[model samples]
Target: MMQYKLILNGKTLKGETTTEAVDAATAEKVFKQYANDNGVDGEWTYDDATKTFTVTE
Candidate 1:
């Protein structure tokens, strides 16, 4: 299992999501879906090495 961190607005909205995928593409897809579902808009990047995502509106 891998743990990914999603940070939004630099810090305002932050959380973690875990998935079996270790690929960057899969992580991005998951992050986008999560954001869209929760109605969050921002710029984001996924780091495969650290398994972290940083977002800003």
Candidate 2:
């Protein structure tokens, strides 16, 4: 499994953070759904080295 960090800011989920596990295809699918949702702002940033995703205002 792989670990990733997700962070949210300047929206409904402001100041939220979590670390999740996704083993691959199946696991990655589930996680993507939430992160790619349209309701959140498009201020997205990704850096693969540390596998981090951030949603900011």
Candidate 3:
């Protein structure tokens, strides 16, 4: 299983999950929850095949 870290408000968050894959759209949805909880503003980016989140500014 691949692990993904949830980021919010410019910090790494506690939430995480092990999954086979995560699409960009799905990442955006998941991160939206984190953002709402943390008062952060941004979207998530994912690679379904690799199950990885994109690192960006």
Candidate 4:
């Protein structure tokens, strides 16, 4: 399993999944789902080193 952090404007979202992905693509899928579900507006990115997902809106 992979650990991931979802952040927006340098702050992590509360109650968000941290370690639920098996790969980078899976993490991206979750991120996209969150964005679409919440109507999130931002530019998202994935870091290979930390397995972190960040959004800059």
lDDT of 1 by residue, 1-57 (tens): 365556554355555556555666777787777777666647886454676776665
- Screening candidate 2 with a backbone cut-off below 3 angstroms (N, C-alpha, C), the clashing residue pairs are none
Question: By the lDDT metric, which is better: model 2 or model 3?
Answer: 2
Per-candidate TM equals 0.60, 0.44, 0.41, 0.62
* lDDT of candidate 3 over 1-57, digit per residue (tens): 334545332555433333333454565566566556565545455554655443233
Model 2 stretches astray by more than 4 angstroms? 11-13, 23-39
TM-score of 2: 0.44
lDDT of 4 by residue, 1-57 (tens): 367767554344533446477777887777777766655636887575776776665
Top-TM-score candidate index: 4
lDDT (CA) for every model shown?
0.64, 0.55, 0.48, 0.64
CA RMSD per model (angstroms): 3.0, 4.1, 4.8, 3.4
Candidate 3 stretches with Cα past 4 Å from truth are 1-3, 9-21, 43-57
lDDT of 3 at 50: 57
- Clashing residue pairs in candidate 4 are none
Off by over 4 Å in 4: 10-16
- Candidate 1: the clashing residue pairs are none
The C-alpha local distance difference test score for the whole of candidate 3 amounts to 0.48
Looking at model 2, report the run of 10 residues with the lowest lDDT sum: 23-32
